[PDB]
Structure formats: structure tokens, C-alpha cells
Design a protein around this ligand. Structure first.
Ligand SMILES: [Mg+2]
Ligand SMILES: [Mg+2]
Ligand SMILES: [Mg+2]
Ligand SMILES: [Mg+2]
Ligand SMILES: [Mg+2]
Ligand SMILES: [Mg+2]
Ligand SMILES: [Mg+2]
Ligand SMILES: [Mg+2]
Ligand SMILES: [Mg+2]
Ligand SMILES: [Mg+2]
Ligand SMILES: [Mg+2]
Lengths: 177, 60, 84, 115
RNA sequence: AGGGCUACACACGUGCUACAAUGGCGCAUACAAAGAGAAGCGACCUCGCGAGAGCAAGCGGACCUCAUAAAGUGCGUCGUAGUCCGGAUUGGAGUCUGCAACUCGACUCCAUGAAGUCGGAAUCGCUAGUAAUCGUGGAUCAGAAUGCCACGGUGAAUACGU
């Protein structure tokens, strides 16, 4: 990774002396990144999930997992076990490289970009964000886009509180408005 | 990671308009040329009234 | 719009009424029929009751209404929908 | 290929292609191309990246795209909050510039609503 | 004095503009008729992207002004796309008339770019310089035509028959 080097060098020290931490593992870490795609339009055409999954593979660089309806839901014509989404869990080198890609190419490519909310913390130091469109990523080609599919991005951390989560995500200059 | 199931994830090059070059692994195959990066976007660097409107046309 | 070389238009009588109102400190609602007069900066904070055809409607002047005409804030037609 | 946060057609002449930007009509397109030294009948595909950055800087001098949309929304919303006749016409979705409503007015009113 | 005749779930009549390539846009360049003008028509020159502004001739007119006709023709481009079609709607900025353009003017500039891809049942005009299409002028009128009245340009098809 490249941003793990930045974490280990700068972010730990700055957060240590900002939060009066006893031990270096009391400092929040970024432990995993999860990217999913709600592709319930698969109900109509399976080909959809396949194309959404290939988009996700292009974005993330690892093959996604096809996720299934946990139940049968009468409001969307889905049975228990019908595939309606994808997911990739990135940890380590791949998640750090994705963090840099998203921070330094992807988010500048969002229409009308004016910062990401800092109230989007789940309550325990985990941040989630959406991506109306996928072209925001340079890994997806434009003159071939079959459909306009967004995605969700969640950053699970060891930060016990939203404050410690913002603090860590800010050390990387995460664009918070 | 598993074998032969993953997209070809090779280190590419990516050059911005303001002269920013980042050596990035991604699954595109070719190199990258992008208009705006994190270091030349209005929000990242911090670049993102009726009495005046009335008085612009109203030099007394 | 009125030509800029002419300046904004306002009826003289209402201009004097407003000038007195700012001078006395007064906030008694100003009665006027000059729907055609432009709202001026010194009108801000005053309440001008603008005739709409049958009744004077109170218009508490703010900063944003400067440059508009008084009549823009006193609708003359009454409409509540058809088949109502 | 990409200007002002949107993609512009590579196959079109430059004057036509630049009009895809919200806030750039033909007149602004010609002005932008004249100030960037680029001919008008040049296809966007056959332009150097440096020429495209020149076009990006020229477009930057105008308010376009989301900035323009926010400006237009703010103007309408100011009118609507003000409660002036123009703002009330915006509220009801009726013609704002004095047009007849006894007939026509279908662009503001939309498709006919049978009784 | 201010408001209304300008309202707006809706139904009809008469029109205008379109839906494009027999076209749109750009550059160049031909050929009319009729008419109006003194609180009027207003040139040239200067300023403005423009509507216009300033200065200011001439003309009560076969003399001066309104006032370059447009379609057309040549060259280029667009290449069948809701488009370089369409120009509604709306935001901003203006001009002029007029004591005064909020209700409720016309026009300009920048931006916006809706419906519409030729129209169900039904139904209208036209037999020749007609229809169709293209501009031009006048009355009313401070300002305010897609209406009305008038003028030329290009210019068809068809009529066996009752
Ligand atoms: Mg009208
Ligand atoms: Mg009437
Ligand atoms: Mg057009
Ligand atoms: Mg006349
Ligand atoms: Mg005569
Ligand atoms: Mg349509
Ligand atoms: Mg077509
Ligand atoms: Mg006959
Ligand atoms: Mg005609
Ligand atoms: Mg007239
Ligand atoms: Mg004729």
C-alpha cells in the first residue's frame, strides 16, 4: 500500500496527540472497505447483476460476491435466495489502493461535487457514502456504459465514536463539507 | 487472493491536467488521463444579495 | 423595465410619506395606491399598505424587495380553483 | 472529451460540441473557441490534450453546469419566498410573464386535466 | 385614484410556428410592386454585440426618408439525430415609448431548449398568374399584429364526366 505508509507515519502520531491515547492500538484504524450494488432489476434480467458485478470488478479489482435476498419480499417480487446485489470486501493493500483511487480520482469526477457529509457516520465511527453514477471512476469506460449504476461505499474502522472516525478520515484529507 | 478469477489488476499511470501523476494499480489495461484530480478541484482546495443587484443597475 | 438613464420611478407623494415615516421613527402602516412605485432602500422596515383594487394589504418591506414595485406584493385577482 | 464535469461529443464540430455544457450556447461557444485559438469546424476527437485544457480554462471563465443550476434555483426560490406576483405564479405552475391562461399555457400547465 | 375587461379544472372557432435535407446554418451575390411621411419620415457620421443612443442632412416628396425585398443563385457545412430540426417555457441583463410598463407593452442580448417525428372520427379552400410558397406596405396607432386591408416575386396539379 501507499496510504498505509501515510497512516503509519503521520496519522497515528497526529491522532495520538489529539486524543490523549495510551497505546498505538487505541488509535482508530481503517479495517475494511465494502462496496455493494443493489441490482434488484436483476428480477427482470439476470444479465443486469452480471453487468453490475463486472462494473464492480472493474472498479475494485477483485471479483464480487453475489448476494441473495435474505427473505421472500412481496414488495419487490423477490424470493428468499434470489440474487439482487453484489459486494466486495477490500482489506489491506487493495483497500488502501482503492482509498487512494477514490479520494484522488473518483470524488473529483462527481457532478456538482461540493464535499461529502460528516453526519454520514453510523454512530460508531463507520462512514458510508453513495455514488449516483459509476463513471466517477476512471476504471469504468464511458463509450460502452450499458446502463447508469451507482454503488454504496462503507468504511468500517476501529474508531469507537463518530468523532474518532471523522478525525481519522480527515487525517487523509477526506473531502468533508 | 484466488487464482484466475480476478480482473487483471496491474499498476497503471494516471496524469492530471495540473501536472499531477499518480502511479496506480487499477483494472483498466491502458493508462489514465483525467481532467480534475484531488489537488485541482474547487472543493478540495476550498474554492466552492438584492441591494447590490438593485444598485448595480441603479447608479442614482 | 424603465430605462436606467431615467432612474427608478416613484410617486412624489409616497416618497414624501416614506421620508416622513423614517423621520418620525413611525411604524404606523403607510396607506398608498402607488402600486407603480419602486421599493427603495429607505423603505426597509416600514409597513406599506398597498391598494389591490378593493383593500390595502400590509406589506412589511424587507431587503429583498428593493427594486421591485409595490404592486408586485398586492395581488389584485382572487382565485381559489375551479370545481372547488 | 471531458469539460466542466460532463462529457462532450468527440465526433462533432467544436462549436456544436461545446454547447452540450449547461450554460454554453452558440454565442458563448464561438467566443470560447475564438479565445482559445481553436477553429470552429474542428472535431473534438482531433484535438490535443493541451487544446482541451485551453478549452477547460476558457469554460472556467463562465458560470456553467451545477453552479448555474444552483444560481437559477436560487433566483426562482427567492421569487417564491418573496411572495411577489412572479413568485406566486411560480408556486402555482402558471405562466409567469403575463401570457394568456384562458387558453394555451400548456407548457406551464402540462397535459390537459379532464374534469 | 386604484383594480378589472389580460382570471383558468375545462370545450369550440379562426390563425401563426413547426415537426426538417425540395432543409438548417455560414459567407457571397441577383431581380419587384404598391404605399406612407411635419408633434412626421428621418439619411450620413460616431458609439453600442444588439434593441438602440448622440449629432444631425434632406423631404409636405417621380427629388429626401421609411427602405438591402425574400424566396432565388454560387460555395461550404451539417448527414437523418428529437438533430447544427423546433423555439415554447423560464432565469439573468437591457432598450424604447409613455406622467406611469407590478397586475399588463414591444423589442434586444446571454443562458434555457418544452411539446412536436406530419396528426382519430370528421372537415376546409382553390379551375391560372389561381392554389401553394416568398417577402413588402398601410389604416388604427405615444407605444402596442401571427388580425385586417393592400402589393408584387416564384409558380403548379387536375377537370374523363354529371
Ligand atoms: Mg399578452
Ligand atoms: Mg376582451
Ligand atoms: Mg435552429
Ligand atoms: Mg404607419
Ligand atoms: Mg407619395
Ligand atoms: Mg416527445
Ligand atoms: Mg426525422
Ligand atoms: Mg370559379
Ligand atoms: Mg404573408
Ligand atoms: Mg402603430
Ligand atoms: Mg401573391
Amino acid at each position: 500500500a501507499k496510504l498505509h505508509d501515510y497512516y503509519k507515519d503521520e496519522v497515528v502520531k497526529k491522532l495520538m496527540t489529539e486524543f490523549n491515547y495510551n497505546s498505538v492500538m487505541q488509535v482508530p484504524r481503517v479495517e475494511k472497505i465494502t462496496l455493494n450494488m443493489g441490482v434488484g432489476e436483476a428480477i427482470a434480467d439476470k444479465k443486469l447483476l452480471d453487468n453490475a458485478a463486472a462494473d464492480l470488478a472493474a472498479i475494485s479489482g477483485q471479483k464480487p460476491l453475489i448476494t441473495k435476498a435474505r427473505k421472500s419480499v412481496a414488495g419487490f417480487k423477490i424470493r428468499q435466495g434470489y440474487p439482487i446485489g453484489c459486494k466486495v470486501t477490500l482489506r489491506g493493500e487493495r483497500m488502501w489502493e482503492f482509498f487512494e483511487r477514490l479520494i484522488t480520482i473518483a470524488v473529483p469526477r462527481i457532478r456538482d461535487f461540493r464535499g461529502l457529509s460528516a453526519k454520514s457516520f453510523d454512530g460508531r465511527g463507520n462512514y458510508s457514502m453513495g455514488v449516483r453514477e459509476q463513471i466517477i471512476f476512471p476504471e469504468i469506460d464511458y463509450d460502452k456504459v450499458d446502463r447508469v449504476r451507482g454503488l454504496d461505499i462503507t468504511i468500517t474502522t476501529t474508531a469507537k465514536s463518530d468523532e474518532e472516525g471523522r478525525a481519522l478520515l480527515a487525517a487523509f484529507d477526506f473531502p468533508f463539507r | 487472493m484466488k487464482k484466475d478469477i480476478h480482473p487483471k489488476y496491474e499498476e497503471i499511470t494516471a496524469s492530471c491536467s495540473c501536472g499531477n501523476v499518480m502511479k496506480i494499480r487499477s483494472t483498466v489495461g491502458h493508462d489514465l488521463n483525467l481532467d480534475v484530480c484531488s489537488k485541482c478541484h474547487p472543493f478540495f482546495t476550498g474554492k466552492q444579495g438584492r441591494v447590490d443587484r438593485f444598485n448595480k443597475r441603479f447608479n442614482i | 423595465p424603465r430605462s436606467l438613464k431615467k432612474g427608478p420611478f416613484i410617486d412624489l407623494h409616497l416618497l414624501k410619506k416614506v421620508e416622513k415615516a423614517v423621520e418620525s421613527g413611525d411604524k404606523k402602516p403607510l396607506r398608498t395606491w402607488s402600486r407603480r412605485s419602486t421599493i427603495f432602500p429607505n423603505m426597509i422596515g416600514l409597513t406599506i399598505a398597498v391598494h389591490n383594487g378593493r383593500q390595502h394589504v400590509p406589506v412589511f418591506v424587507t431587503d429583498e424587495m428593493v427594486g421591485h414595485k409595490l404592486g408586485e406584493f398586492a395581488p389584485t385577482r382572487t382565485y381559489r380553483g375551479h370545481a372547488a | 472529451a471531458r469539460i466542466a464535469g460532463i462529457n462532450i461529443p468527440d465526433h462533432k464540430h467544436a462549436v456544436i460540441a461545446l454547447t452540450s455544457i449547461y450554460g454554453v450556447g452558440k454565442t458563448r461557444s464561438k467566443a470560447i473557441l475564438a479565445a482559445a485559438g481553436i477553429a470552429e469546424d474542428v472535431k473534438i476527437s482531433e484535438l490535443s490534450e493541451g487544446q482541451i485544457d485551453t478549452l477547460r480554462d476558457e469554460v472556467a471563465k463562465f458560470v456553467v453546469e451545477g453552479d448555474l443550476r444552483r444560481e437559477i434555483s436560487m433566483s426562482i426560490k427567492r421569487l417564491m419566498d418573496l411572495g411577489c406576483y412572479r413568485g406566486l405564479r411560480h408556486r402555482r405552475g402558471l405562466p409567469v410573464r403575463g401570457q394568456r391562461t384562458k387558453t394555451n399555457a400548456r407548457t406551464r400547465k402540462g397535459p390537459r386535466k379532464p374534469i
